């Protein structure tokens, strides 16, 4: 959660990030000072032009005055370019760094986090929030520093010619400051509400796009359209709140600083102020008040813009100091020696208050196969997900090679497991890239072909019009279901991991295809550790230990023949299949 801090506070938090890029900031500050000096000197040129008159005084200034103007414009252009380029460069580097940090943070979150989240919300953090940071820090930030520097120059030029009027400017400045204070807080609150609504908009569009087929066959167009109308109208209304605050704050602040113009006119009318200086300083003074009212308008509008990025930065910080996957193990394993043991483990899913597994005393020896069978919802995929530390157990210990799983580095632990999940997910790339997903430089194309041949996928790959270089859809949509399953099987088989978990990996396949895959698995996994979750008993008939699970407890365990004796649960499953 994010408490509205302030602009200065979020800049202090931003500094650890902006610190590598100090040089561009320093040069841009120098350029800004020079640019403001050029602006102020140009607007000061009046007093020579007026006092040293066109014909009243000798024409000695007006001859060189045009060249002074053109040269000051030359310098002003150069310094403005340098300042803008360097500030924009620093902002772009900061924004890219924050985007990369947010991506890495999301990639390091636990599985339960993604279970309780929506993809559209996080994608909104990546797209909308960071683009608000970028838009603010690039455009609005240049505008605010340049107009502040202009204002300071006009202040300096005014305190010089006649301080007696700069004093009223001094007294009004705090009022304008505290006004901008209050409006800025309002802007930041509105911007955070807008961030949340944009997350909702993205969630709605996401859910429509990924469930397009269900929308089409169940006639959901009305419901989705109505939902999107709701969220988009809410987005419009919050933008309207922001505009209301902006267009109510700008005129009031311009009304306040106009009192300076009223005061200078009253001071001029007063019979004791003039005659101190001739036509000249007071003309410069009135021109400088009229000038000064302009950067105020610019400053307030770009403050409306700028608080959006400030709020987005505050949200970013709140996300970046969240906790990630709990990783406090430091005993990396080069290659596990197969053994996996469950000791009286009890597991409850987050916020579900009923155990999914109760007292699991299950051994998976090295080189052996355990086959998990049982009805739907009994807890087999839960055991599979506990082996990989997707979730952490509540009681008991899961040991690998004699050591607790939590003792290990997460990355080191997961390098020991190759998993074909119940729900197959593929990436929108080629078949070879999908099979060697995260190891495209480590595995030869010959190794990829051997993997695809062990997965009975080599036949339908050779019938593709591009070979192993055919691009498959977003989730392998351009493939049949069994073909996607077989590709995921090949992906897991490419890595000769000591522990291989198949989670109903023959569900979308036909009997002959599964027999071929099972024959390949025979020789490849004769000395690997294997865990097979099957709802079909023909797949698991040769497993070393069959284990029957129900409601999260092991109810029987044994070999196929010993379990076909003993006339228990497995006997009933086998008889009715």
């Amino acid at each position, epitope marked *: 959660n994010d408490k509205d801090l302030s602009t200065w506070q979020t800049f202090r938090r931003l500094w650890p990030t902006i610190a590598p890029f100090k040089a561009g900031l320093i040069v841009a500050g120098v350029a800004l000072i020079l640019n403001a000096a050029s602006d102020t000197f140009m607007l000061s040129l009046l007093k020579p032009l007026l006092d040293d008159g066109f014909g009243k005084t000798d024409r000695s200034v007006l001859v060189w005055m045009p060249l002074v103007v053109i040269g000051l414009m030359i310098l002003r252009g150069i310094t403005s370019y340098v300042s803008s380029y360097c500030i924009s460069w620093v902002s772009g580097k900061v924004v890219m760094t924050m985007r990369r940090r947010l991506f890495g943070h999301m990639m390091g979150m636990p599985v339960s986090f993604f279970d309780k989240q929506s993809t559209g919300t996080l994608l909104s953090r990546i797209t909308y929030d960071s683009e608000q940071v970028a838009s603010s820090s690039s455009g609005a930030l240049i505008t605010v520093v340049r107009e502040g520097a202009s204002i300071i120059g006009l202040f300096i030029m005014m305190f010089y010619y006649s301080w007696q009027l700069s004093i009223i400017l001094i007294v009004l400045a705090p009022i304008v400051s505290i006004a901008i204070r209050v409006v800025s807080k309002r802007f930041r609150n509105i911007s955070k509400n807008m961030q949340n609504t944009m997350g909702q908009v993205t969630t709605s569009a996401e859910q429509m796009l990924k469930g397009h087929k269900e929308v089409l066959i169940f006639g959901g167009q009305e419901v989705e359209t109505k939902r999107f109308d709701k969220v988009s109208n809410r987005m419009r209304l919050q933008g309207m709140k922001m505009v209301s605050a902006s267009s109510i704050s700008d005129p009031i602040i311009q009304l306040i600083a106009s009192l300076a113009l009223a005061f200078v006119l009253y001071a001029a009318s007063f019979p004791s102020v003039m005659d101190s200086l001739t036509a000249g300083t007071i003309t410069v003074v009135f021109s400088s008040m009229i000038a000064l009212m302009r950067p105020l308008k610019s400053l307030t509008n770009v403050n409306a813009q700028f608080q959006r990025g400030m709020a987005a930065c505050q949200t970013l910080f709140t996300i970046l100091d969240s906790e990630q996957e709990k990783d406090e193990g430091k005993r990396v394993i080069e290659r596990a020696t197969g053994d996996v043991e469950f000791r009286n483990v009890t597991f409850t899913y987050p916020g579900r208050d009923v155990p999914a597994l*109760r*007292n699991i005393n299950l051994k998976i020896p090295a080189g052996k196969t355990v086959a998990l069978v049982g009805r739907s919802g009994s807890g087999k995929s839960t055991i599979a997900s506990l082996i990989t530390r997707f979730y952490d157990i509540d009681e008991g210990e899961i040991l690998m090679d004699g050591h607790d799983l939590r003792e290990y580095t997460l990355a080191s632990l997961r390098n020991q497991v190759a998993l074909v999940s119940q729900n197959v997910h593929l990436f929108n790339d080629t078949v070879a890239n999908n099979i060697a997903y995260a190891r495209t430089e480590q595995y030869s194309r010959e190794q990829i072909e051997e993997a695809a041949r062990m997965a009975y996928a080599m036949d339908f790959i050779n019938k593709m019009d591009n070979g192993l270089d055919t691009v498959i859809g977003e989730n392998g949509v351009l493939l049949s279901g069994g073909q996607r399953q077989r590709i995921a099987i090949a992906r897991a088989l490419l890595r000769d991991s000591p522990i291989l978990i198949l989670d109903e990996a023959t569900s979308a396949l036909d009997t002959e295809s599964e027999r071929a895959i099972q024959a390949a698995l025979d020789e490849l996994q004769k000395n690997r550790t294997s865990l097979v979750i099957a709802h079909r008993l023909s797949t698991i008939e040769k497993a070393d*230990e069959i284990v*029957v699970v*129900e*409601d999260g*407890v*092991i*109810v*029987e*365990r*044994g*070999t196929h023949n*010993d*379990l076909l*004796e*003993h*006339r*228990g*649960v497995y*006997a*009933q499953l086998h008889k009715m299949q």
Partner: nanobody
Amino acid sequence: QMQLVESGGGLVQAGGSLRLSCAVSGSIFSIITLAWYRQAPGKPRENVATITRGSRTSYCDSVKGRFTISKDNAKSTVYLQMNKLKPEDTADYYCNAEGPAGYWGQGTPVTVS
């Protein structure tokens, strides 16, 4: 650690009646499978009776209709009931919890005149 202890009988005459009990502790007794196995001096262990959560019972054909298998959840005790015993039943009887690859008790000898 779940452990299961047998309380059995001794020597009975032919055609007599016997009842063996097995107390199972440390178990989820309402769900796990329980069984009674037997072992003659020569032959290996052979499943005699099986009982499962839904109180469904099974038996070796050569003994169906004579033995009964029951379980009391409240006392968490499994029971084997002997009727019309024969000399071929003289053997060491074991109870078993959750499968032939699970947990076994000490076992009790039964002799038939």
